[PDB]
Design a binder for this molecule. Sequence first.
Ligand SMILES: Nc1ncnc2c1ncn2[C@@H]1O[C@H](COP(=O)(O)OP(=O)(O)OP(O)(O)=S)[C@@H](O)[C@H]1O
Ligand SMILES: Nc1ncnc2c1ncn2[C@@H]1O[C@H](COP(=O)(O)OP(=O)(O)OP(O)(O)=S)[C@@H](O)[C@H]1O
Lengths: 367, 293, 74
Amino acid sequence: QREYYLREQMKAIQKELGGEDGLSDLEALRKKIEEVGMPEAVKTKALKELDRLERMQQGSPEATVARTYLDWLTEVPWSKADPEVLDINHTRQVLDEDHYGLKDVKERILEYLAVRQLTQGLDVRNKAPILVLVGPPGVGKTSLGRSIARSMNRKFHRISLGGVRDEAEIRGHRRTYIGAMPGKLIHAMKQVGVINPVILLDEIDKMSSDWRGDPASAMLEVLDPEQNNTFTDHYLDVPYDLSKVFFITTANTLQTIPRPLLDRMEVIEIPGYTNMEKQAIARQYLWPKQVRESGMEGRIEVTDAAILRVISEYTREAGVRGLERELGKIARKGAKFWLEGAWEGLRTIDASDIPTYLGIPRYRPDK
Amino acid sequence: QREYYLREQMKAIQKELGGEDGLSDLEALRKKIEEVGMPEAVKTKALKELDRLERMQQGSPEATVARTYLDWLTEVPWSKADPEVLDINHTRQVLDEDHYGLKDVKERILEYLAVRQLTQGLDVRNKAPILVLVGPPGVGKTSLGRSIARSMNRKFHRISLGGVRDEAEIRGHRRTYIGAMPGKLIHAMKQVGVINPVILLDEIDKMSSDWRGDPASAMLEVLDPEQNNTFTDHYLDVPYDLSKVFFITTANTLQTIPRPLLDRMEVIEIPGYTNMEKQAIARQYLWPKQVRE
Amino acid sequence: QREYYLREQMKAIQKELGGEDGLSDLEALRKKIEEVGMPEAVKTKALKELDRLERMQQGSPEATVARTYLDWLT
Ligand SMILES: Nc1ncnc2c1ncn2[C@@H]1O[C@H](COP(=O)(O)OP(=O)(O)OP(O)(O)=S)[C@@H](O)[C@H]1O
Ligand SMILES: Nc1ncnc2c1ncn2[C@@H]1O[C@H](COP(=O)(O)OP(=O)(O)OP(O)(O)=S)[C@@H](O)[C@H]1O
């Protein structure tokens, strides 16, 4: 009765002090606290904190730090996941809808997805592969992340490490500063609603160092499967649990990745396509896209011999960006010729009609 | 006590005079957020930041950061465009009165406009081209930029690369840092009022790259032909759409461009003029200008 | 001056509800510094925080550094 009557007096004085807020402030933040999570030390630290913002209303810069720290602390997911997959026959069907070929990456995903069923007595969910995909520029390394996320029914988020020179892009700044915010990883874990997404780190061989810091030293702490159980940035004081996260990183060469990161990654090399692989990719992915995006759908059509003519005589490369630029050129000039004088039915571009659209061939074929 | 008395007089008769007060700033910002654009995640972000701002101390070392951030969010463009499909003969007549010859670039622009006429009213993806123009040092590579922009009635902006070694020119800073502000691309999209300008990136093959300082790797995100739906600099913490903007870049050799950056761009050779072309250019463009001046 | 009076009376009530919460920030130190071990200079430098008392419920920017200092020291 004594603690309750004193808390009644607190409620009364705050009632004349509050204006529906200062009053509905906690039932905001404690439905936020008691609904999600949480680990016990983090909850006790947050509750030994939450009392101590009796400081606004003639103030404060003290309350606008603490309440936003509690806002960041109650919207990052604590132990809330998505259901695991039950067919490895459905994952294969979804992976074959988006890309042609690429048997090594697809089989490696199916292997590490079939290991995760058979293990009860758990050593495996602590170790998802830190996977790195290495290859020449036109091959589908970046567009393969979203398909892997869709086939396992998991959430996706891409982080681009292109020219990052700054620590506190990985970690944060401590909340004693003015505009302190957490890093990219806590922000990505907030955007994704769950604790087990797929995260793509786009060019990891391209990070820059600096005199003040080096983000590779911070990226070691994230991709280490002995430290990311207790990952801690500078904004959130509490340790945070990664390693439910499935990381995929992509790269052009291995020679400029730092040495403490190469030894903790499994490397899959992607070599570049042959001409039959490029002809299949062209026919069932690249030509319908370029026909749709130019308006000429149902009015023009290319044959297989013409696709071989384009591949052999107008491009040489490992990937497929130049091939889709040539096919888009055929679509643009088809639109131009239609808009001059229309025809009916569909015009069929045969292999002796390619220099009408593309010009003089660039490479002479071997014979 | 006297300076406290001054404090309370000034706060009273200033910010509670009634008429000449800050009715307009926060509430006009409130109504401005829900008019221009914007995507729903960005709008939720902006409204939560505004509600965070409306409880801060009068001052302030932290309210300036939030108000500057909301100003940058509200005056960058979201879904506003000067119009597409035009008359094609009128644009070829405008293109022919600024430059002699150069048939490949003119045909690329005209068949872009043909595609814009045929896809009018459909529900298909619209992606703007990304070109590089390669040639010897005197040919009209830079001069085609505002001519192509004036032909299609679009806004023009010119970023000069070359010598640039700082990565904080492409993206920005975190805005925890004190005088932070976004990169050149968001600033260029702010100067232009629309979401589809023509932006000239001039001498792209002269960016200076080493093991500390590499802005040519940050350009891989801005010129990616299907991942610049979501371009994130470090100042704005939202993904920004750079897929409608017509990029034209200029170079005079292809050897000092990195290979992943070269592979994202469509290359147009501009070879160098003959003697008959030089005589026509001198009769129609160079000698009347040098006579007038 | 009304709300100043109200903040100060509620802060009075708040530190009189801080018994064994804000009070008893010492007794882990009596548990672990009078054990086997610590020399007398460590007794001097370790009991440095008992009569620096009335500053953790008052503010502070340096309030919770006491549990940090003790949990790292003893
Ligand atoms: N097997 C494939 N089937 C279908 N499309 C493919 C295939 N391989 C590549 N592509 C397409 O190729 C395009 C370019 O692929 P990207 O992954 O974006 O290139 P990249 O792998 O990121 O390499 P970088 O970033 O230049 S080092 C995308 O539009 C993919 O859809
Ligand atoms: N075909 C042309 N017709 C008319 N004027 C031209 C033509 N080619 C070049 N010029 C003029 O030549 C001048 C120089 O052109 P610029 O575009 O500045 O050359 P540039 O290619 O930009 O040089 P750099 O070294 O590569 S930046 C301008 O005044 C142009 O108007």
